[PDB]
Structure 1
Amino acid sequence: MISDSMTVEEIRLHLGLALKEKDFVVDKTGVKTIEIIGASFVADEPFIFGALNDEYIQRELEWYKSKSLFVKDIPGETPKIWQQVASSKGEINSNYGWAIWSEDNYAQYDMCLAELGQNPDSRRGIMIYTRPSMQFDYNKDGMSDFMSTNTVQYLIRDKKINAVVNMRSNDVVFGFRNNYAWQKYVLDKLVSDLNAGDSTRQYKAGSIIWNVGSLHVYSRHFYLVDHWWKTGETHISKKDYVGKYA
């Protein structure tokens, strides 16, 4: 329930407990992960662990605005992770701007805006990112990119627009921070676009509720969890870290 959810601080706690208990799950790539299964929490902070990176977030936003399905179109030197999951032609699936703004994905943003504009109380205000053909599209031309965001639903209650984000899979360190920045962007845009449609509406952004099948940390970031466990600091440079996960 929206008003009675876990917080990000409680998510940190449960991830710390999973590491302490050595409750490891082996990733498809062979490395260890720790997870929360069926996570559900209000994103009351914009990160869980790790450093800020407004600069990558702005690059990702421009890539999303371009709607390009090719990773080289990310501004600047495209990150190694995107080069690795891309197809033989540099193609991917998970351009979230394509997902919500392309006519080839059935105009998710515009139809959600139109639905809520005609019925503010509607339960049908949703942006549908994934697709049934993803069962075969996730490795087209050799890519490795099964859509992780499934749907985001928008529910206007007491003049606040709440976003229910439904994710299959979310990396705690980079994925959550980037995805949170993106979902908050879309929510603020929907609030603004609805308010611009009619000055009587006077909507505000509500809560972003994060629901994840597997919310996980890769072994290469266990040091961030361990350092926080010991100190309460949500970030440390890998250079400065002292512990058993170097």
Structure 2
Amino acid sequence: NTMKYIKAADFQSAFKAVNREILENPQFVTDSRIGRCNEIGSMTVVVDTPSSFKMTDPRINRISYEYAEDFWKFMISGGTDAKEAFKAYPNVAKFISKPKSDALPANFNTFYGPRIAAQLPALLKELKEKPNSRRVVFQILESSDQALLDSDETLEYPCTDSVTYYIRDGKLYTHCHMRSQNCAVVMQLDFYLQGKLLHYIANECGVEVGDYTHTMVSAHVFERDFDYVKGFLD
């Protein structure tokens, strides 16, 4: 039976367990916007030790850690010069190009970094100053992104919905809610970015780290990636 709740000691064990479950016990086998995938709806993943966001198995190699670190620096710096930041990676071109349609402005982008940057002052203030706040939610996906739905744009319609942080008894807890997760490939990047970000937040707040929860409305592995996944399982 499809296991939707996965608790693991570290990011890599969670990553392997999620991918194995999607391959072996999918809830749906579905033809999606970008091809056929196995899918589990509404998976919840808990990582006990969020310092482990750099996975050690070199067979999990579709997101290199050079790329992941370049992406982290691009994101946390809150800039929009993706062409410069990812000039060494030509295959990300369709995700970093200017909008084509005149409908939405040319300043429009879906980069997470500027959105995190805009919210950091108010959210850090709440996180540091309102004891036991439940209100600290970084919004990534925005309703204004819905202008992308009926367009031919290739920009990411944000896969990450929100990241909630809360502190209890000196520890920072994190809940990343994903609208849509490519578990075999991009999740390696998402885990890296979220691991870096939560440590950034914990350090700004002077607190230690609890655990990390990752919910995914669609947790999927494309059929084209099954051989890749099998290559890192066992």
What is the number of residues matched between the two proteins? 211
SS at match of 1:193: helix
Q: CA deviation at 1:35?
A: 1.5
The residue that corresponds to 1:158 in the other structure is 169
Distance 2:70 2:228 in 1: 24
Structure 2 unmatched ranges of 5 or more: 9-13, 101-105
Q: CA deviation at 1:137?
A: 4.0
Whether 1:24 and 2:29 are equivalent positions in the alignment is: yes
Equivalent pair of 2:44/2:214 in contact (CA under 8 Å): yes
User: Against the structure 1 CA distance between its residues 193 and 84, is the aligned structure 2 distance closer, same or farther, given a 3 Å change threshold?
Assistant: same
Whether 1:40 and 2:44 are equivalent positions in the alignment is: yes
Amino acid at match of 1:94: T
Q: CA deviation at 1:147?
A: 1.0
The match for 1:219 among 213, 216, 223 is: 223
Equivalent pair of 2:43/2:215 in contact (CA under 8 Å): yes
Amino acid at match of 1:13: R
The match for 2:143 among 109, 115, 132 is: 132
SS at match of 2:33: coil
The residue that corresponds to 1:209 in the other structure is 213
Deviation string 1:106-165 (CA, Å, 9 cap, x unpaired) is: x21221110011113000011111211111145778334211111111111221101100
Distance 2:98 2:141 in 1: 22
Distance 1:226 1:97 in 2: 33
Q: Note the aligned Cα RMSD (angstroms).
A: 2.8
Equivalent pair of 1:85/1:145 in contact (CA under 8 Å): yes
SS at match of 1:57: helix
Distance 2:144 2:99 in 1: 20
- The two structures have a TM-score, normalised by structure 2, of 0.77
Whether 1:190 and 2:201 are equivalent positions in the alignment is: yes
Equivalent pair of 1:138/1:144 in contact (CA under 8 Å): no
The residue that corresponds to 2:93 in the other structure is 83
- The within-5 A match list for 1:91-170 is 93-101=109-117, 107-137=118-148, 142-170=153-181
User: Against the structure 1 CA distance between its residues 54 and 127, is the aligned structure 2 distance closer, same or farther, given a 3 Å change threshold?
Assistant: same
Equivalent pair of 1:93/1:146 in contact (CA under 8 Å): no
Distance 1:210 1:146 in 2: 19
SS at match of 1:127: strand
Q: CA deviation at 1:183?
A: 1.1
SS at match of 1:6: strand
Amino acid at match of 1:209: T
Deviation string 1:9-64 (CA, Å, 9 cap, x unpaired) is: 54243123137x9x5211213x2111121010113564598226210111112222
Distance 2:152 2:182 in 1: 24
Distance 2:163 2:21 in 1: 25
User: Against the structure 1 CA distance between its residues 138 and 69, is the aligned structure 2 distance closer, same or farther, given a 3 Å change threshold?
Assistant: farther
Structure 1 unmatched ranges of 5 or more: 102-106, 196-202, 233-246
User: Against the structure 1 CA distance between its residues 112 and 15, is the aligned structure 2 distance closer, same or farther, given a 3 Å change threshold?
Assistant: same
The residue that corresponds to 1:200 in the other structure is none
